[PDB]
Amino acid sequence: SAEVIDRFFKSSGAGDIETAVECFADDGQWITPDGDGLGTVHTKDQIGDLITSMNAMREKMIASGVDGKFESPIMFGENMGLVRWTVETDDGKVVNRGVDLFILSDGKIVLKDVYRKVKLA
Amino acid sequence: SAEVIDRFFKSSGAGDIETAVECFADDGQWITPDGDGLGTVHTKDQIGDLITSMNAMREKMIASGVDGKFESPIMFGENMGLVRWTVETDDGKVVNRGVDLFILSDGKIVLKDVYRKVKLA
Ligand SMILES: CCC[C@H]1C(=O)CC(=O)O[C@@H]1CC(=O)/C(C)=C/C[C@@H]1O[C@](C)(CCO)C[C@@H]1C
Numbered sequence: 001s002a003e004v005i006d007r008f009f010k011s012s013g014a015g016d017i018e019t020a021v022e023c024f025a026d027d028g029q030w031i032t033p034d035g036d037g038l039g040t041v042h043t044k045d046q047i048g049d050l051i052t053s054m055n056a057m058r059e060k061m062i063a064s065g066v067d068g069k070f071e072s073p074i075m076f077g078e079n080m081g082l083v084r085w086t087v088e089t090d091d092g093k094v095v096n097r098g099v100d101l102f103i104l105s106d107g108k109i110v111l112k113d114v115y116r117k118v119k120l121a
Numbered sequence: 122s123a124e125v126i127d128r129f130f131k132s133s134g135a136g137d138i139e140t141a142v143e144c145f146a147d148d149g150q151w152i153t154p155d156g157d158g159l160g161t162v163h164t165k166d167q168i169g170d171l172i173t174s175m176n177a178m179r180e181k182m183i184a185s186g187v188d189g190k191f192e193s194p195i196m197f198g199e200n201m202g203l204v205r206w207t208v209e210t211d212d213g214k215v216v217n218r219g220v221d222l223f224i225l226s227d228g229k230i231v232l233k234d235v236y237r238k239v240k241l242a
Protein backbone atom coordinates (compact mmCIF):
# COMPACT_ATOMS: atom_id res chain seq x y z
CA SER A 1 0.00 0.00 0.00
CA ALA A 2 3.11 2.16 0.45
CA GLU A 3 1.30 3.71 3.43
CA VAL A 4 4.51 3.25 5.44
CA ILE A 5 6.27 5.71 3.15
CA ASP A 6 3.63 8.34 3.91
CA ARG A 7 3.81 7.47 7.61
CA PHE A 8 7.60 7.88 7.52
CA PHE A 9 7.51 11.30 5.86
CA LYS A 10 4.72 12.61 8.07
CA SER A 11 6.34 11.51 11.32
CA SER A 12 9.92 12.38 10.39
CA GLY A 13 8.86 15.78 9.08
CA ALA A 14 6.95 16.54 12.29
CA GLY A 15 9.80 15.41 14.55
CA ASP A 16 7.89 12.33 15.73
CA ILE A 17 11.14 10.40 15.81
CA GLU A 18 9.86 7.24 17.45
CA THR A 19 7.10 6.65 14.89
CA ALA A 20 9.52 7.38 12.06
CA VAL A 21 12.07 4.88 13.37
CA GLU A 22 9.41 2.22 13.77
CA CYS A 23 8.61 2.49 10.04
CA PHE A 24 11.82 0.56 9.40
CA ALA A 25 12.28 -3.19 9.58
CA ASP A 26 14.56 -4.29 12.40
CA ASP A 27 17.10 -5.16 9.68
CA GLY A 28 16.33 -2.08 7.60
CA GLN A 29 18.86 0.47 6.47
CA TRP A 30 18.88 4.12 5.54
CA ILE A 31 21.84 4.90 3.28
CA THR A 32 22.70 8.59 2.89
CA PRO A 33 23.68 10.10 -0.46
CA ASP A 34 27.19 11.15 0.58
CA GLY A 35 29.44 9.10 2.89
CA ASP A 36 32.81 9.65 1.18
CA GLY A 37 31.48 8.41 -2.13
CA LEU A 38 30.03 5.18 -0.72
CA GLY A 39 26.96 6.31 1.21
CA THR A 40 26.68 6.10 4.99
CA VAL A 41 24.69 3.09 6.17
CA HIS A 42 22.49 3.75 9.20
CA THR A 43 20.80 0.82 10.90
CA LYS A 44 17.49 1.20 12.69
CA ASP A 45 19.10 2.10 16.03
CA GLN A 46 20.86 5.02 14.33
CA ILE A 47 17.94 6.46 12.34
CA GLY A 48 16.41 8.51 15.14
CA ASP A 49 19.59 10.55 15.54
CA LEU A 50 19.76 11.06 11.77
CA ILE A 51 16.23 12.43 11.60
CA THR A 52 16.87 14.77 14.52
CA SER A 53 20.01 16.17 12.91
CA MET A 54 18.41 16.46 9.47
CA ASN A 55 15.40 18.33 10.85
CA ALA A 56 17.71 20.74 12.71
CA MET A 57 19.42 21.58 9.44
CA ARG A 58 16.22 21.74 7.44
CA GLU A 59 15.25 24.44 9.92
CA LYS A 60 18.49 26.32 9.20
CA MET A 61 18.01 25.87 5.44
CA ILE A 62 14.47 27.22 5.61
CA ALA A 63 15.75 30.28 7.46
CA SER A 64 18.46 30.62 4.77
CA GLY A 65 15.79 30.57 2.04
CA VAL A 66 15.97 26.98 0.72
CA ASP A 67 13.87 23.90 1.43
CA GLY A 68 13.20 20.44 0.11
CA LYS A 69 10.15 19.45 -1.88
CA PHE A 70 9.15 15.79 -2.26
CA GLU A 71 6.89 14.24 -4.90
CA SER A 72 4.39 11.49 -4.17
CA PRO A 73 5.99 8.04 -4.53
CA ILE A 74 6.06 6.31 -7.88
CA MET A 75 5.43 2.64 -7.06
CA PHE A 76 7.01 -0.06 -9.18
CA GLY A 77 7.08 -3.37 -7.40
CA GLU A 78 4.22 -2.88 -4.95
CA ASN A 79 7.35 -3.25 -2.78
CA MET A 80 9.37 -0.43 -4.34
CA GLY A 81 8.73 3.30 -4.30
CA LEU A 82 10.74 6.11 -5.88
CA VAL A 83 10.33 9.52 -4.23
CA ARG A 84 11.83 12.32 -6.31
CA TRP A 85 12.87 15.48 -4.52
CA THR A 86 14.36 18.89 -5.11
CA VAL A 87 16.13 21.50 -3.05
CA GLU A 88 14.82 24.86 -4.19
CA THR A 89 14.63 28.51 -3.29
CA ASP A 90 11.46 30.35 -2.29
CA ASP A 91 10.89 31.54 -5.87
CA GLY A 92 11.24 27.99 -7.20
CA LYS A 93 14.85 27.95 -8.41
CA VAL A 94 15.93 24.31 -8.22
CA VAL A 95 19.50 23.99 -6.93
CA ASN A 96 19.69 20.19 -6.34
CA ARG A 97 17.58 17.18 -7.14
CA GLY A 98 17.73 13.57 -6.20
CA VAL A 99 15.78 10.46 -5.35
CA ASP A 100 14.81 8.31 -2.37
CA LEU A 101 14.48 4.63 -3.23
CA PHE A 102 12.23 2.79 -0.77
CA ILE A 103 12.29 -1.01 -0.62
CA LEU A 104 9.37 -2.30 1.43
CA SER A 105 8.55 -5.66 2.95
CA ASP A 106 5.59 -6.53 5.16
CA GLY A 107 4.56 -2.92 5.68
CA LYS A 108 8.03 -1.83 6.82
CA ILE A 109 10.96 -0.08 5.14
CA VAL A 110 13.85 -2.45 4.50
CA LEU A 111 15.91 0.09 2.55
CA LYS A 112 15.82 3.85 2.13
CA ASP A 113 18.61 4.53 -0.37
CA VAL A 114 19.13 8.24 -1.08
CA TYR A 115 20.94 9.79 -4.06
CA ARG A 116 21.57 13.36 -5.14
CA LYS A 117 22.84 14.73 -8.41
CA VAL A 118 26.45 15.86 -8.00
CA LYS A 119 27.74 19.41 -8.25
CA LEU A 120 31.34 19.14 -9.48
CA ALA A 121 34.36 21.48 -9.24
CA SER B 122 11.96 -8.94 -20.49
CA ALA B 123 14.57 -6.26 -19.72
CA GLU B 124 16.54 -7.67 -22.66
CA VAL B 125 17.01 -4.09 -23.89
CA ILE B 126 19.05 -3.32 -20.78
CA ASP B 127 21.41 -6.19 -21.60
CA ARG B 128 21.49 -5.09 -25.25
CA PHE B 129 22.37 -1.55 -24.16
CA PHE B 130 25.24 -2.62 -21.90
CA LYS B 131 26.67 -5.09 -24.41
CA SER B 132 26.61 -2.65 -27.32
CA SER B 133 27.70 0.43 -25.39
CA GLY B 134 30.51 -1.48 -23.71
CA ALA B 135 31.76 -2.80 -27.06
CA GLY B 136 31.61 0.61 -28.74
CA ASP B 137 28.68 -0.41 -30.95
CA ILE B 138 27.28 3.08 -30.64
CA GLU B 139 24.47 2.78 -33.16
CA THR B 140 22.91 -0.29 -31.51
CA ALA B 141 23.25 1.32 -28.10
CA VAL B 142 21.50 4.50 -29.23
CA GLU B 143 18.69 2.51 -30.80
CA CYS B 144 17.94 0.93 -27.41
CA PHE B 145 16.36 4.24 -26.43
CA ALA B 146 12.85 5.42 -27.25
CA ASP B 147 12.79 8.39 -29.59
CA ASP B 148 11.63 10.44 -26.58
CA GLY B 149 13.99 8.70 -24.17
CA GLN B 150 16.50 10.43 -21.95
CA TRP B 151 19.78 9.58 -20.31
CA ILE B 152 20.38 11.81 -17.30
CA THR B 153 23.95 11.87 -15.96
CA PRO B 154 24.72 11.85 -12.24
CA ASP B 155 26.45 15.24 -12.16
CA GLY B 156 25.33 18.26 -14.22
CA ASP B 157 25.90 21.04 -11.67
CA GLY B 158 23.73 19.31 -9.11
CA LEU B 159 20.77 18.81 -11.46
CA GLY B 160 21.91 16.04 -13.80
CA THR B 161 22.59 16.59 -17.50
CA VAL B 162 19.72 15.48 -19.71
CA HIS B 163 20.79 13.86 -22.99
CA THR B 164 18.17 13.13 -25.61
CA LYS B 165 18.52 10.25 -28.03
CA ASP B 166 20.41 12.31 -30.62
CA GLN B 167 23.05 13.12 -27.98
CA ILE B 168 23.56 9.64 -26.51
CA GLY B 169 26.00 8.36 -29.11
CA ASP B 170 28.48 11.12 -28.31
CA LEU B 171 28.08 10.42 -24.58
CA ILE B 172 28.89 6.74 -24.99
CA THR B 173 31.93 7.52 -27.13
CA SER B 174 33.30 9.94 -24.55
CA MET B 175 32.53 7.64 -21.62
CA ASN B 176 34.27 4.69 -23.28
CA ALA B 177 37.34 6.85 -23.98
CA MET B 178 37.58 7.66 -20.29
CA ARG B 179 36.82 4.15 -19.14
CA GLU B 180 39.89 3.23 -21.17
CA LYS B 181 41.96 5.84 -19.32
CA MET B 182 40.54 4.70 -15.96
CA ILE B 183 41.41 1.07 -16.70
CA ALA B 184 44.97 2.12 -17.52
CA SER B 185 45.01 4.10 -14.25
CA GLY B 186 43.95 0.99 -12.32
CA VAL B 187 40.20 1.55 -11.76
CA ASP B 188 37.13 0.25 -13.57
CA GLY B 189 33.39 -0.02 -13.19
CA LYS B 190 31.55 -3.18 -12.24
CA PHE B 191 27.81 -3.54 -12.88
CA GLU B 192 25.38 -5.97 -11.24
CA SER B 193 22.58 -7.71 -13.11
CA PRO B 194 19.39 -5.61 -13.08
CA ILE B 195 16.93 -5.91 -10.25
CA MET B 196 13.52 -5.67 -11.93
CA PHE B 197 10.62 -4.09 -10.10
CA GLY B 198 7.88 -3.04 -12.45
CA GLU B 199 8.56 -5.37 -15.36
CA ASN B 200 9.15 -1.85 -16.74
CA MET B 201 11.75 -0.75 -14.19
CA GLY B 202 15.26 -2.05 -13.62
CA LEU B 203 17.84 -0.96 -11.05
CA VAL B 204 21.47 -1.64 -12.02
CA ARG B 205 23.85 -1.15 -9.11
CA TRP B 206 27.46 -0.37 -9.90
CA THR B 207 30.80 0.30 -8.28
CA VAL B 208 34.04 1.95 -9.26
CA GLU B 209 36.81 -0.16 -7.81
CA THR B 210 40.52 -0.84 -7.97
CA ASP B 211 42.11 -4.02 -9.30
CA ASP B 212 42.30 -5.53 -5.80
CA GLY B 213 38.62 -4.80 -5.18
CA LYS B 214 38.77 -1.58 -3.17
CA VAL B 215 35.46 0.18 -3.84
CA VAL B 216 35.94 3.93 -4.26
CA ASN B 217 32.46 4.94 -5.56
CA ARG B 218 29.09 3.30 -5.92
CA GLY B 219 25.86 4.31 -7.52
CA VAL B 220 22.82 3.19 -9.44
CA ASP B 221 21.35 3.26 -12.94
CA LEU B 222 17.57 3.45 -12.96
CA PHE B 223 16.09 2.14 -16.22
CA ILE B 224 12.48 2.92 -17.13
CA LEU B 225 11.35 0.78 -20.04
CA SER B 226 8.38 0.93 -22.37
CA ASP B 227 7.69 -1.30 -25.37
CA GLY B 228 11.14 -2.86 -25.37
CA LYS B 229 12.93 0.52 -25.38
CA ILE B 230 14.60 2.66 -22.72
CA VAL B 231 12.55 5.74 -21.90
CA LEU B 232 14.79 6.86 -19.03
CA LYS B 233 18.29 5.98 -17.88
CA ASP B 234 18.71 8.03 -14.70
CA VAL B 235 22.17 7.70 -13.13
CA TYR B 236 23.18 8.53 -9.55
CA ARG B 237 26.43 8.26 -7.64
CA LYS B 238 27.12 8.55 -3.95
CA VAL B 239 28.79 11.89 -3.23
CA LYS B 240 32.32 12.43 -1.95
CA LEU B 241 32.24 15.68 0.03
CA ALA B 242 34.95 18.20 1.02
C1 LIG C 1 21.76 21.48 4.51
C2 LIG C 1 22.16 20.08 3.91
C3 LIG C 1 21.09 19.57 2.94
C4 LIG C 1 20.36 18.30 3.49
C5 LIG C 1 21.19 17.06 3.72
O1 LIG C 1 21.88 16.65 2.81
C6 LIG C 1 21.02 16.38 5.09
C7 LIG C 1 20.97 17.34 6.22
O2 LIG C 1 21.39 17.11 7.36
O3 LIG C 1 20.36 18.58 5.98
C8 LIG C 1 19.66 18.77 4.82
C9 LIG C 1 18.27 18.13 4.82
C10 LIG C 1 17.33 18.75 3.82
O4 LIG C 1 17.67 19.35 2.80
C11 LIG C 1 15.90 18.48 4.00
C12 LIG C 1 15.16 19.46 3.33
C13 LIG C 1 15.54 17.42 4.70
C14 LIG C 1 14.11 17.15 4.81
C15 LIG C 1 13.58 16.42 6.01
O5 LIG C 1 14.23 15.09 6.10
C16 LIG C 1 13.39 14.12 6.75
C17 LIG C 1 14.19 13.73 8.00
C18 LIG C 1 13.07 12.91 5.83
C19 LIG C 1 14.24 12.47 4.89
O6 LIG C 1 14.46 13.33 3.89
C20 LIG C 1 12.06 14.92 7.06
C21 LIG C 1 12.09 16.11 6.04
C22 LIG C 1 11.48 15.68 4.73
Ligand SMILES: CCC[C@H]1C(=O)CC(=O)O[C@@H]1CC(=O)/C(C)=C/C[C@@H]1O[C@](C)(CCO)C[C@@H]1C
Pocket residue numbers: 130133134171172174175176178179182188189190208
Ligand atom coordinates in the same frame (compact mmCIF):
# COMPACT_ATOMS: atom_id res chain seq x y z
C1 LIG D 1 36.60 8.92 -15.07
C2 LIG D 1 35.17 9.43 -14.70
C3 LIG D 1 34.30 8.30 -14.14
C4 LIG D 1 33.12 7.95 -15.10
C5 LIG D 1 32.09 9.03 -15.38
O1 LIG D 1 31.56 9.58 -14.42
C6 LIG D 1 31.74 9.27 -16.85
C7 LIG D 1 32.93 9.28 -17.74
O2 LIG D 1 33.04 9.95 -18.77
O3 LIG D 1 33.98 8.41 -17.41
C8 LIG D 1 33.79 7.46 -16.43
C9 LIG D 1 33.00 6.25 -16.90
C10 LIG D 1 33.22 5.02 -16.06
O4 LIG D 1 33.59 5.03 -14.88
C11 LIG D 1 32.82 3.74 -16.63
C12 LIG D 1 33.49 2.70 -15.98
C13 LIG D 1 31.92 3.73 -17.60
C14 LIG D 1 31.49 2.43 -18.11
C15 LIG D 1 31.01 2.30 -19.52
O5 LIG D 1 29.84 3.19 -19.72
C16 LIG D 1 28.95 2.69 -20.74
C17 LIG D 1 28.99 3.79 -21.81
C18 LIG D 1 27.53 2.42 -20.20
C19 LIG D 1 27.03 3.44 -19.11
O6 LIG D 1 27.65 3.29 -17.93
C20 LIG D 1 29.62 1.33 -21.19
C21 LIG D 1 30.52 0.93 -19.97
C22 LIG D 1 29.71 0.16 -18.97
